[PDB]
Amino acid sequence: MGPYRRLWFTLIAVLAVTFALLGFYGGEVYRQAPPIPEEVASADGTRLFGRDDILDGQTAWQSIGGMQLGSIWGHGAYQAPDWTADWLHRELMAWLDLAARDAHGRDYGQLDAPAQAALREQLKAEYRANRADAAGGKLTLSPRRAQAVAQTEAYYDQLFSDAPALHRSRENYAMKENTLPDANRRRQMTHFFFWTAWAAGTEREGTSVTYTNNWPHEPLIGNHPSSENVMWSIISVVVLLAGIGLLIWAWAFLRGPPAPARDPLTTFALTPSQRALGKYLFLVVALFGFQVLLGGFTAHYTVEGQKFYGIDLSQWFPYSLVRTWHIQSALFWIATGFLAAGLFLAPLINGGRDPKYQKAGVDILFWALVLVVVGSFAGNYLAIAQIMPPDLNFWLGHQGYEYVDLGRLWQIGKFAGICFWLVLMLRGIVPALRTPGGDKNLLALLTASVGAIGLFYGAGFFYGERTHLTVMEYWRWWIVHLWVEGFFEVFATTALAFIFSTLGLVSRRMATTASLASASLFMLGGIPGTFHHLYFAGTTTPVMAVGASFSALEVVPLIVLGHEAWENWRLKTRAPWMENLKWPLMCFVAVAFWNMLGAGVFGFMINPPVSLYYIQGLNTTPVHAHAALFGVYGFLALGFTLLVLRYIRPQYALSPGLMKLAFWGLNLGLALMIFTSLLPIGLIQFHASVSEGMWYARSEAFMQQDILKTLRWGRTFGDVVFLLGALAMVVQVILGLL
Amino acid sequence: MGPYRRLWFTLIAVLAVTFALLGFYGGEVYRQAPPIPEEVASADGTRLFGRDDILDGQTAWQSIGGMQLGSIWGHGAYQAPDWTADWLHRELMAWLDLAARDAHGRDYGQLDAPAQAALREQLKAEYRANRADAAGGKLTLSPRRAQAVAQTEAYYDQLFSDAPALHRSRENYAMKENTLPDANRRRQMTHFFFWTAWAAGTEREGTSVTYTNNWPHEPLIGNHPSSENVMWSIISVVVLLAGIGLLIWAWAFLRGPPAPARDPLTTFALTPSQRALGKYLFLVVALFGFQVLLGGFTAHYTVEGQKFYGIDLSQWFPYSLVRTWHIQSALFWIATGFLAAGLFLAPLINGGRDPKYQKAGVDILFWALVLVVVGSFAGNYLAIAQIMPPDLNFWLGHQGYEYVDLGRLWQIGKFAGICFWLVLMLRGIVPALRTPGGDKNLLALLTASVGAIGLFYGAGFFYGERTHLTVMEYWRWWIVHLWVEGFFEVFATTALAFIFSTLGLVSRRMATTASLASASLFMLGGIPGTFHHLYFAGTTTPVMAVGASFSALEVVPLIVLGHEAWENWRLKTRAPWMENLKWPLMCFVAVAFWNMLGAGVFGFMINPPVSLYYIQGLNTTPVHAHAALFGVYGFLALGFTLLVLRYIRPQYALSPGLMKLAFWGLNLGLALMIFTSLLPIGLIQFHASVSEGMWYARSEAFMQQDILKTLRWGRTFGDVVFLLGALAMVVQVILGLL
Numbered sequence A, B: 001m002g003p004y005r006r007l008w009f010t011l012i013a014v015l016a017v018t019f020a021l022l023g024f025y026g027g028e029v030y031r032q033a034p035p036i037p038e039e040v041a042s043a044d045g046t047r048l049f050g051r052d053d054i055l056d057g058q059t060a061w062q063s064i065g066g067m068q069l070g071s072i073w074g075h076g077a078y079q080a081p082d083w084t085a086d087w088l089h090r091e092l093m094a095w096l097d098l099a100a101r102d103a104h105g106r107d108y109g110q111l112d113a114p115a116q117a118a119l120r121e122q123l124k125a126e127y128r129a130n131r132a133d134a135a136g137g138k139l140t141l142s143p144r145r146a147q148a149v150a151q152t153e154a155y156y157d158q159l160f161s162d163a164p165a166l167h168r169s170r171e172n173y174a175m176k177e178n179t180l181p182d183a184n185r186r187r188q189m190t191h192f193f194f195w196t197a198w199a200a201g202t203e204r205e206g207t208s209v210t211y212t213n214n215w216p217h218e219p220l221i222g223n224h225p226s227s228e229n230v231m232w233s234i235i236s237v238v239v240l241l242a243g244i245g246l247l248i249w250a251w252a253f254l255r256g257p258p259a260p261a262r263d264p265l266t267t268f269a270l271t272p273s274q275r276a277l278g279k280y281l282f283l284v285v286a287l288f289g290f291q292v293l294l295g296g297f298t299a300h301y302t303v304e305g306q307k308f309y310g311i312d313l314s315q316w317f318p319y320s321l322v323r324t325w326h327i328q329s330a331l332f333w334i335a336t337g338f339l340a341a342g343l344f345l346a347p348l349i350n351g352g353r354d355p356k357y358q359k360a361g362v363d364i365l366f367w368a369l370v371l372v373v374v375g376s377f378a379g380n381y382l383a384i385a386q387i388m389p390p391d392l393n394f395w396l397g398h399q400g401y402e403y404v405d406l407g408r409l410w411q412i413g414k415f416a417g418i419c420f421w422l423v424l425m426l427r428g429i430v431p432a433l434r435t436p437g438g439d440k441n442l443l444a445l446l447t448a449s450v451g452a453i454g455l456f457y458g459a460g461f462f463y464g465e466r467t468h469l470t471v472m473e474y475w476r477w478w479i480v481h482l483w484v485e486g487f488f489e490v491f492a493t494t495a496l497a498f499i500f501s502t503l504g505l506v507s508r509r510m511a512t513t514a515s516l517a518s519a520s521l522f523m524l525g526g527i528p529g530t531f532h533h534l535y536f537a538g539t540t541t542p543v544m545a546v547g548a549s550f551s552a553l554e555v556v557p558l559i560v561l562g563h564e565a566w567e568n569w570r571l572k573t574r575a576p577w578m579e580n581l582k583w584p585l586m587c588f589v590a591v592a593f594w595n596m597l598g599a600g601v602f603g604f605m606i607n608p609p610v611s612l613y614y615i616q617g618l619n620t621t622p623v624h625a626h627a628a629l630f631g632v633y634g635f636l637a638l639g640f641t642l643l644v645l646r647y648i649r650p651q652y653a654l655s656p657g658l659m660k661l662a663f664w665g666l667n668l669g670l671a672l673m674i675f676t677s678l679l680p681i682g683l684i685q686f687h688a689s690v691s692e693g694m695w696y697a698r699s700e701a702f703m704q705q706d707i708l709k710t711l712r713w714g715r716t717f718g719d720v721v722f723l724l725g726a727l728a729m730v731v732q733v734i735l736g737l738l
């Protein structure tokens, strides 16, 4: 309570109206989803696959890499072409030849211009029709379409089967040699690729958009952005520029501490529990050196084929296996960065004593946390090699969906570990607010943050092996755009301000009101901002209305970062003994520079739904993904490491001269391979994706254009700058642990 | 010179690099203009009109209102449809009917869908070809196109002719009854319309865009935006956001006065010259009341036809006359407000004495201005009614182009009056900085601003009666986007800081650096920002490449207006005698609010070239025009009126209770007639313009859709608030002049 009745009500007011908006629209994503047809038949009488064969074909797609091989409805990896827009153009060109063979005498390519436009108008009448029969379950597609589907089916049966004809196209797609040894799996898998491009073509009931909201930009069947799609883009621009101006207008009008001579953390000297965190500062730097070194190993498969300078490590370590470890070990060391600074802050609040069985609680968390890492990395190896039986795949092995690629049995092992980290926080915080005090204001906010950071991983359930892919793309982003983006940015603002409150630099009054205006602004457009990962995947038009207007308000408090980047840096002059923490106070400054240039600048370039239409599935998304994940949550795990290196080894200097290469190799290393080798490839692809089609921007005839070859062979001029910038950090921490 | 060596070098550096970028591209706008063909002939052998007939048709179009009747290439008025898209659609449907009449047996409307798409591909083949013969001067268009042009000539001959059949379509376009009594004048005007929509269809040499950069969005002949258009749009967006964030960053990191007891302006008491400004302060409010009444009179012709509750004032006072007066008297009173403020500031700088024959120039300049006003209005009335002979039209009468609609002789009169104001400034300012002092830092900037504001009306020359329309649209925006937008915003910052410096509130050190940091920022994207009025008018793609990217940087220093709207309002508390200037210190705050909400927010909504494509010529442009013209330079001539009411009548109070109404009527009326009756009309026109075509968003089958009728019949509820606010302000000024 206290005098904070205004602030503590407007945070619950945001978390009540902007939290039912994932629930009032969460039923809209379910019952407006593209249905899987019960029976696919031809008009002559034969019966093709049904809804059982599609779902078993989905499990065949998961066993080869899932979204880490080639993207489906845009989301995935960006080397192999998306199989819902590469199946589409190969099916329409098969139809255009089977409708020209009995038209004059020739094919679609050898007709003059006025007569070849009399066939693309017949494509719009058949392929933008023949939807479901209103719970009759039948499809009954045309017999000229039954021959074109079976014609292109033999091309995808020959691509995943070790055939000698399609070499040097399995080399530009970074598929190993087989990718599916069994024969009935890839006969069932390419039935699933039909349904993922059946829904991309058929019209919804009465409207002028498709089931996937007109996504794969194809000039044959008239796939152009909607009328309501362009009108909801210009509304999304005026929300931003009238939000930035009205924030600085209300900031400049509605406004209106001697430091101690000793550091108050060295007066405690707690030996038994906080000395056991030396392992956790090793697991951060061991996974960080392993995660960069995979990056130079998965970017090598982009440039070359599968050679690796002599013998090929391609039948053991293919592209979709080294990419799966590159994302998954990245989310671990960001997670165990906060887990070190979380458990360090547990016994420091309740005086300087530990709870009962605290060191016994820490020493069994770490050996269960390392059980998951080397336990999930075996499941990826025994599933992409296709050794494990396919019925037991989802539980241990490989899930298929990116950012949740650890198996279901191992996924409980990550959820049980953070839930065990939850009770080790609450046993050390309930003797601090259940005591009769009157200053439990920051402690009540931090209690709500630790309760939310460990229970929002549980939304990674509610989807199993065989549920509908629109349901698998709704609960998946609840832990990527709400647990990594949202609630890692609440816990890293309070616990950041809790340290500056304890050292005696902020006066605990402007450390709480600054942590409820910077905890409700990030949540105003953060919980209903989940929906900008669900534009073109089985949704209606109001889903891009909630996710393009209420998503610009998480770009409003990110551009204005002059404050909270100077008043976290001018704390250096407030004490003579703030030279010992100079380098953590330089990492919490370069968090702010990449929270406006990775989340604000490069994050709004792809936000409005006319410019996510042409960009979704290109090389402009890993510009935003590399910069907003290492820049914002990747310098916090290195700011909470070189701070926790102090107070547990308070005798070793940080050795400047090494840190000036360990800090200025991460910044300039990240801003040189983005602005030379990932951004200009993302604009040659954008110039082709809006001119010709979506299939043209990922086709292998385009990605070997002799200008996109010299623009990814120049990744290595920035890769080795990042490499030595990462080695100089881990050599410091290993030297610091002695 | 002095300690200001950095700023006074970077301002000349900006005005040196961003000023050759107008000349080196003005050469490109000249030598890449769409040529007028020397001879138009048919393929059978006959000879149609030539280029002289096209130029006489241009003069005939000028004689009836010019751009105030119906827009040409988007620029103009927004009631009658743009003739270069309406002519285009009528000519294309005439060609489709003449090519279907000899195809099977029917027309384009009564053909099935696959066979009517075999004629639009022939429209794409014939109409996107047959350009000029490489300076051969001939056209030699197809005889079917000759028959289609001769067929659609008769409708536009019948529309401007008093013909009975075409009533109640001459009433929804607000044309009086005749608009052209002579017959050869409209017979040549139709040929001019043929030229201005011939340039909208033909392909440039080798490229894939037209001469007017693919402008009139027509799905028949494939008029869709380019790829480089969309690429420069996304580049413009990232330039804006990366500008705002870096400006706030470098503001927050790179930083580092007793008031007197008496007002220092009442200590001078200069009686002979400054008492002669009552005529100017009466002329400002007289033209302001007359202009608001003309605005209320010209919006009635939108809602009703030409009735005016009984007898019609339509053959004497048509829509074109009242619209021309509504723009021109607005520009006149906005100019003479600054003129009176500068002439007040003239003798105060050189101590408290006047130059020789100072009262005589003031006493003749007022009668010269009022002579120019009544002669221009008499010329408009005697030119639109078609009484004055067509040989003598451009000199006195009506020019045709909007914002320069006063005739050439009256234009020389206005330029001579502003030059007389210039020499009256320089005869009073040169004995103040030629004295041996060391404080001529602000006065040099003010002298350069006076030399800028008084000379660049002279770029309204260099185009006469018969030059090419791309040349007439290059020198026209040199006095609308560089003399009104740019150099009225330099003269209003230095004079404001000079007044706040002379009064003894700022310390003259932060009044100079803040008047070059806020004079070099507005000029970085202001002089090469002219080019966003020249996207789709006879230009190439480098012109929009300059005018998007280098124009987003004049939106960057406008959103951040928390500073320069609080440090100009917190000057009120610095003295007890700053209650006498309370209302100018609210006008100079409403200037900042509408400068961020009419130039930033609603001004960037229409800026990027993919969203100016569908918007150019709609009801979203008068939103930005009414907001940024009365909001920024309209409260400035009401701040410099109620400040100059002090120090010449320093005995009459401002009478609060009336000033609250005269402020919060203007603000609430301008913010309520924009957000109710001009913004959703603009959004409905945007939706229909991006769905169907450009002809559909201005057609009279669409602008009576029964929802656009109730959305402009609610203009009056915002009109009467603005009306009563204007009446309260003028009755206050008339009561104060006694």
Ligand code: HEM
Binding pocket: A076, A077, A078, A079, A291, A292, A294, A295, A296, A298, A299, A302, A323, A326, A327, A330, A331, A621, A622, A625, A626, A629, A630, A634, A718, A719, A722, A723
């Ligand atoms: C020198 C440093 C790095 C290199 C060479 C590298 C390599 C790569 C490459 C080539 C991709 C593109 C994969 C594809 O095309 O499908 C990628 C994706 C990704 N990287 Fe890195 N990486 C580096 C640093 C990092 C770091 C430090 C992190 C996080 C802690 C990270 C997180 C990610 C993520 C999340 C993706 C997935 C993007 C997406 O699929 O949309 N990267 N990495």
Ligand code: HEM
Binding pocket: A075, A076, A484, A485, A532, A533, A551, A552, A554, A555, A598, A599, A600, A603, A604, A606, A607, A612, A615, A616, A617, A618, A621, A624, A625, A628, A629, A632, A633
């Ligand atoms: C602040 C921390 C942020 C993080 C950690 C983050 C992380 C990510 C990642 C890793 C992806 C790639 C997902 C994938 O490959 O499937 C992504 C995509 C995306 N992000 Fe962010 N992001 C952040 C901020 C933002 C912001 C502020 C916006 C504002 C509009 C935004 C808009 C988007 C959009 C539209 C996509 C979809 C791009 C696509 O699917 O191709 N992000 N985000």
Ligand code: HEM
Binding pocket: B076, B077, B078, B079, B292, B295, B296, B298, B299, B302, B323, B326, B327, B330, B331, B621, B622, B625, B626, B629, B630, B634, B718, B719, B722, B723
């Ligand atoms: C109650 C107040 C006003 C009313 C009813 C009014 C009426 C109108 C109307 C209906 C238009 C649209 C003409 C068309 O559609 O072609 C217009 C245009 C315009 N008005 Fe006003 N007006 C008002 C106030 C003002 C003021 C105070 C200014 C001060 C400078 C102003 C400047 C302009 C300009 C420059 C245009 C031309 C916009 C363009 O052609 O793009 N108006 N006025």
Ligand code: HEM
Binding pocket: B075, B076, B484, B485, B532, B533, B551, B552, B554, B555, B598, B599, B600, B603, B604, B606, B607, B612, B615, B616, B617, B618, B621, B624, B625, B628, B629, B632, B633
């Ligand atoms: C600050 C003072 C400003 C003033 C006095 C002003 C005035 C005007 C006026 C009167 C028009 C209408 C021209 C016509 O009807 O032909 C116009 C158009 C336009 N303005 Fe502004 N403007 C200002 C700021 C801005 C800014 C900051 C931008 C930034 C991008 C901008 C972008 C545009 C564009 C693109 C158009 C063309 C719209 C069209 O032709 O339909 N304006 N301006």
Ligand SMILES: [Ca+2]
Binding pocket: A075, A076, A077, A402
């Ligand atoms: Ca991805």
Ligand SMILES: [Ca+2]
Binding pocket: B075, B076, B077, B402
């Ligand atoms: Ca206009």
Ligand SMILES: [Fe+3]
Binding pocket: A481, A485, A529, A530, A532, A533
């Ligand atoms: Fe997101």
Ligand SMILES: [Fe+3]
Binding pocket: B481, B485, B529, B530, B532, B533
């Ligand atoms: Fe402009």
